[PDB]
Design an enzyme around this catalytic site. Structure first.
Site, short mmCIF file in Angstrom:
data_model
loop_
_atom_site.label_atom_id
_atom_site.label_comp_id
_atom_site.label_asym_id
_atom_site.label_seq_id
_atom_site.Cartn_x
_atom_site.Cartn_y
_atom_site.Cartn_z
N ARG A 73 -2.90 -3.18 6.76
CA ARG A 73 -3.56 -2.23 8.17
C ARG A 73 -5.08 -1.45 7.26
O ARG A 73 -5.84 -1.16 7.72
CB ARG A 73 -2.28 -1.25 8.86
CG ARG A 73 -1.31 -1.31 7.89
CD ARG A 73 -0.26 -1.43 8.51
NE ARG A 73 1.29 -0.71 7.58
CZ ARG A 73 1.99 -0.91 6.40
NH1 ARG A 73 1.08 -1.17 5.40
NH2 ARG A 73 2.62 0.20 6.25
N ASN B 107 7.67 -9.31 0.60
CA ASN B 107 8.13 -8.43 0.93
C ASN B 107 8.47 -8.17 2.70
O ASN B 107 7.11 -7.98 3.01
CB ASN B 107 7.37 -6.63 0.07
CG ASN B 107 7.63 -5.65 0.61
OD1 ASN B 107 8.54 -5.51 0.90
ND2 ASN B 107 6.81 -4.67 0.60
N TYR C 49 5.53 -5.34 19.66
CA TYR C 49 5.44 -5.12 18.79
C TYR C 49 7.10 -4.99 17.77
O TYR C 49 7.93 -3.93 18.31
CB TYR C 49 4.67 -3.91 17.40
CG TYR C 49 2.92 -4.15 17.99
CD1 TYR C 49 2.71 -3.52 18.87
CD2 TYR C 49 2.15 -4.53 16.88
CE1 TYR C 49 1.34 -3.75 19.80
CE2 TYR C 49 1.42 -5.12 17.00
CZ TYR C 49 0.41 -4.74 18.71
OH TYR C 49 -0.59 -4.63 17.83
N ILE D 142 16.02 1.19 3.20
CA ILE D 142 15.89 2.57 2.98
C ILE D 142 15.53 3.02 4.12
O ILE D 142 14.80 3.61 4.75
CB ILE D 142 14.74 3.30 2.37
CG1 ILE D 142 13.54 2.13 1.92
CG2 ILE D 142 15.13 3.82 1.05
CD1 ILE D 142 12.52 2.37 3.51
N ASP D 143 16.84 4.24 4.50
CA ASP D 143 16.89 4.53 5.95
C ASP D 143 17.25 5.80 6.02
O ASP D 143 16.87 6.44 7.02
CB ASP D 143 18.47 4.40 6.13
CG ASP D 143 18.67 4.81 7.40
OD1 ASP D 143 18.53 4.26 8.24
OD2 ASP D 143 19.74 5.24 8.04
N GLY E 275 5.51 2.93 0.93
CA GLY E 275 6.67 2.55 0.87
C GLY E 275 7.71 1.65 -0.12
O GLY E 275 6.85 1.80 -1.65
N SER F 241 1.47 -1.17 0.30
CA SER F 241 0.14 0.03 0.16
C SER F 241 0.89 1.43 0.23
O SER F 241 0.64 2.65 -0.37
CB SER F 241 -1.17 -0.14 1.15
OG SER F 241 -0.50 0.04 2.47
N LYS G 264 20.73 -10.74 7.08
CA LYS G 264 20.79 -11.46 5.59
C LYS G 264 21.08 -12.61 5.35
O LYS G 264 20.76 -13.53 4.86
CB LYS G 264 22.16 -10.44 5.47
CG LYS G 264 23.91 -10.99 4.99
CD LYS G 264 23.57 -11.46 3.44
CE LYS G 264 24.79 -11.83 3.23
NZ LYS G 264 24.83 -11.69 1.45
#
Lengths: 247, 247, 252, 252
Positions: C34, C86, C148, C184-185, C12, C10, C155
């Protein structure tokens, strides 16, 4: 007379058992503790009651000059270091940096760096007495707090890469570098332990002595040809995702 | 009475030293040889002179029914197997298949397959006496001949992947699977050895006993929690490309 | 038309991967955990590209619901050609009680979820001559929220499960790879009040020009699923600008 | 115009990589070990694509000659943007006497050669803001010829040296990766009188549709050097259709 071993985080848990085992093998021991003078001096006393001299020194991962000072003390107490157990399996907590919030890799980076800084400092002293051995150990116990307070452990990949790197840097100074990763296993104490018992194949729960044996092996003169290896000691728990799928 | 150990390729070299060490630890020994009854029976005699019963059986990698028959003999001689040293570090030669000419991967494939076939056969017998231990060992000695005759050794990657695979298949049968890769070191005999001596850092030439120690460690009850691990024992020789570059 | 499923799509990285695959001419299945609206918005944007779209709700630790989603894809499109498996979505899941004891148990539950989905996808792909599965993962925002945790995998666990899947499924003409590209940070994808102060902290600690973005993980996924990558099997690619070994570079 | 060096590029995988990069608009340096004519023919074919070309002779174990080739590239083009560090050429080299004793010594000499070339290339790339290095390798035709061996390196050695280079050179804006893709086992690239009988043997032992070709190694090299791969550092990709783990698949 005797050879000298430094064990970090050794006032309790795996550090203590490792320093005990080595005291039983006739090393003079350096006990290092972060806050908790009580357990540390108790532990020094036990050690001392086997013959074998002890030194107690305080220092934690976030203290570079205190760490250098700790090696400067070792040199002034014993004038040599033979065996260094670079312990990140102690479950000692360190404050979270804002950085780490953004990605797990930053935690691993900070913790691998600490392992590397200690091992290099140790290497400057060891190379006075013709080298010796370093074994890095690590476990990723829990994440109780994150309000600050996270693990000093590294993952197996970062541990592997860090110990491969050290063996090539230090093999030319006669320092034998290896590692062990695993780690044995607050309220509900009993219930979390029974949860962990029923989820583990019978007979395959790692204990502290299991990590201690391997370190002991690696540090005997029966392993001088093992270089830059990282051994997983955990009864297969990190690959249980495969046993259950593969059936 | 005694526990039983099979060592393949044990009429000489590393197999022999491994079967000797284990005889010294009180196992009944199965000596396996490919052509060369002479060395084999000499070796059996030595073994026998420590107390400890011995059985001598002939079979080579290219003989599936002979291999099954070998385990059927073990069962009829001792009725149990506890420790299996799946030896591809023997420097025993096997005929080249036309396939292998086309790519090194086909050799590795054929040799990994042989390691796997033996370990699985062994597992069918071990699981009668509540499991036991398998350690696969390997070395890629030379390439003297290629007119047929190549190594039975596997590379470290294929050994790693094969032993990870076995531990998940066999941990549920109480068989503890690990591996060791390395291998110690025709005319000019002396000159090739001096070439190898000057190219190795002093003090870092692996010997047979160095591989034997590790196997011994892995097979003691001090390693029961090490699963599916492949240990490189070679004094760092396989990463010397990095020491010399990194200086 | 071919069909592609992307879980956690949905928002990202999963959203951006569904868009890229819709741009390559696949019909898309959007899976959300969600929020319905995000998934509805994404569905509408991908529809504007001229492919059909199916929105299904399912989260990990709902194995019955997962099984039905694949039955829904078969009901709606009757095929499945690409599965972007994912675990890099940053979606949180409820902590199981054992996993308090050791990091390994979280990694085991997360890896088991990736395995189970890929196996479910594979049964479906059997019926149209197989396809491509790519598992992606990020251990991003292990922030805080008692009870949570991340659905992400490390890895080593990603590598071992991807090895396993490729060995199990290549015989079925299913090409399996993975991208760990620690992910992606950077990214306003991260719900911390200080959002901004944290990005600049991430930025000031990473060499210049070396901050990974979503599109880099997506470019690898797209190459792995293009025709140009069919002989790559069971590989796990780290896409992170070297972030996971910065320690060695500091050291030198 | 940008500039690309590919070693062992008169024939085989290096030839095909030089063509693909010429097709992307790089000037090409052809390095050959042995036959002038092949290199001259390849140079002429790439010229027909409208890029300039430079032919230089050099083989491994000639460190002075290697150093001069890079001095020649600087003399001719004055820059270097992509280096395909080719140990997958099947070129044979003279066996050193120690290496008779153990496979490890061959792997050490081969890895040291890859290291030394990439380091030489890197000094040059410094002057134009860095670039891309990809090392490729195949342990193909370890046939026979007393006194001759492969220049190829194994996966583990390729992985360790590529890790090392990426850590050493990322700080210099040089992106380093590798393809081991065990390489092409197919291929009339293999000078055995029985050439034909051997291909059909290779073909009958490998699952259908899973025979790697040169173009698959080339497609990965091209993706690694395109703009779409800049955040991938120090990775080694096996491109072989799973050939190197066929043993596990047989087993199951």
């Amino acid at each position: 007379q005797n050879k000298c071993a430094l064990v970090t985080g050794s006032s309790r848990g795996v550090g203590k058992a490792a320093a005990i085992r080595l005291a039983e093998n006739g090393y003079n021991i350096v006990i290092n503790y972060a806050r908790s003078k009580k357990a540390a001096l108790e532990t020094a006393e036990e050690i001392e009651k086997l013959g074998v001299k002890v030194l107690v020194v305080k220092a934690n991962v976030g203290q570079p000059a205190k760490i250098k000072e700790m090696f400067q003390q070792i040199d002034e107490t014993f004038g040599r270091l033979d065996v260094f157990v670079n312990n990140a399996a102690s479950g000692v907590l360190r404050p979270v940096m804002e950085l780490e919030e953004t990605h797990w890799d930053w935690t691993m980076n900070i913790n691998a760096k600490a392992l590397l800084f200690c091992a290099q400092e140790a290497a400057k002293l060891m190379e006075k007495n013709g080298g010796g051995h370093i074994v890095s150990i690590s476990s990723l116990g829990s994440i109780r707090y994150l309000e600050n307070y996270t693990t000093v452990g590294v993952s197996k990949a970062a541990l592997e890469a860090l110990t491969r790197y050290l063996a090539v840097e230090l093999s030319p100074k006669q320092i034998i570098v290896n590692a062990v990763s695993g780690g044995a296993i607050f309220p509900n104490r009993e219930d979390l332990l029974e949860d962990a018992r029923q989820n583990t194949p019978a007979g395959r729960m790692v204990e502290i002595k299991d990590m201690v044996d391997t370190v002991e092996f690696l540090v005997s003169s029966k392993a001088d040809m093992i270089r830059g290896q990282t051994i997983i000691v955990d009864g297969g728990r990190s690959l249980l995702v495969l046993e259950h799928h593969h059936h």
